[model samples]
Target: KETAAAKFERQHMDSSTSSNYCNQMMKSRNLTKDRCKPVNTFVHESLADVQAVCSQKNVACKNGQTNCYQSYSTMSITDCRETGSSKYPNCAYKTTQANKHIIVACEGNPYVPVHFDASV
Candidate 1:
């Protein structure tokens, strides 16, 4: 059950802030609902879950490779990539801005639908 304050926070808060952010960056969007469908985040076991969908994935440390980070039981991530791949150099390109979530505003013409949309 949601308290009165929690209800007010979701309903009245501006949709321009994120509850989570990376240490190198900051949160900049309201990741909530009532206006649109809630975001569905997906992650994998191979790579690290640095965007907070579930618990972190375990990564084995190769011999003499000490830069890799290990996962805890329930650690939250604070980063996102453009191509969702760290292998290819071009994958580093992000279509979105630094710390903002993209919105397909329908108020204007030629508006594009987001993944959240159920159908046409």
Candidate 2:
């Protein structure tokens, strides 16, 4: 069976397409158990670049988690979000995409993206 981590990757696209997040759902990521929320990522690079980041220099999470790492190369990633008082399918976000190092947090024996797509 595909684990949550794998699901995250399979669903996550290269250089997060703003509208790409709709390909998946909050329930799939297990983020809707209690509250209803939207999730998405636009990855503007190959999967190799995503994997290679595991070995890149450490990056500090915007939330201040030390588990995050940042790749030396800049990548383009856009997140799907809702405007205040807005809901999913709204796609109410702007062109905040920028070339920045990716920050990811990993856990478990074989670390994978736990906190992913942190632009820096």
Candidate 3:
């Protein structure tokens, strides 16, 4: 079974760069299991850097959860947006790279990010 922390890492963490990154990762990470994930963000930073975000200041998540925290620094990231033409079992995505502050939901003992809330 995959823990939330481990799932977060599988779905969000990536230190490398590539033009076809999303196409490859979205499937490999299992986000495209039955259907295409509408949107996802991959952070190009060390695991420690992301885990440390759990200790940063708190913020409200999109769903109004107060367990979220915003990173104090901008991080390199890639946004994968599903194309309108995308279909199940053959998901497609458009990738956009950027440097921005990330907001994530942290939880559990030794608190670490469990969900990616947004990128500002």
Regions more than 4 Å wrong, model 2 = 15-40, 62-65, 88-95
Model 3 spans with C-alpha error above 4 angstroms:
none
Per-residue CA lDDT of model 3 for 37-98, tens digit only, reads: 99999999999999999999799889987999999999999999998888888898999999
- Which candidate gets the maximum TM-score versus the true structure? 3
lDDT per residue as tens, model 1, 19-98: 22211121222232122212222211222222221122323234333222233433221233333342322222222223
lDDT by residue for model 2 (15-115), tens: 43334343244335444445445545556787677766777787666787677778888887655554465454433333245667777776666666654
Give all candidates' CA lDDT scores: 0.24, 0.59, 0.92
In the predicted model 2, the residue pairs found to clash are 14-43, 14-44, 15-42, 15-43, 15-44, 16-41, 16-42, 16-43, 17-42
Q: For model 1, what is the alpha-carbon lDDT of residue 20?
A: 24
Model 3, TM vs. native: 0.95
Residue 94 local lDDT, model 3: 92
Q: Please, what is the TM-score per model?
A: 0.18, 0.62, 0.95
What's the CA RMSD for each of the models? 19.2, 4.3, 1.0
Error (Å) of candidate 1 at residue 46 is 25
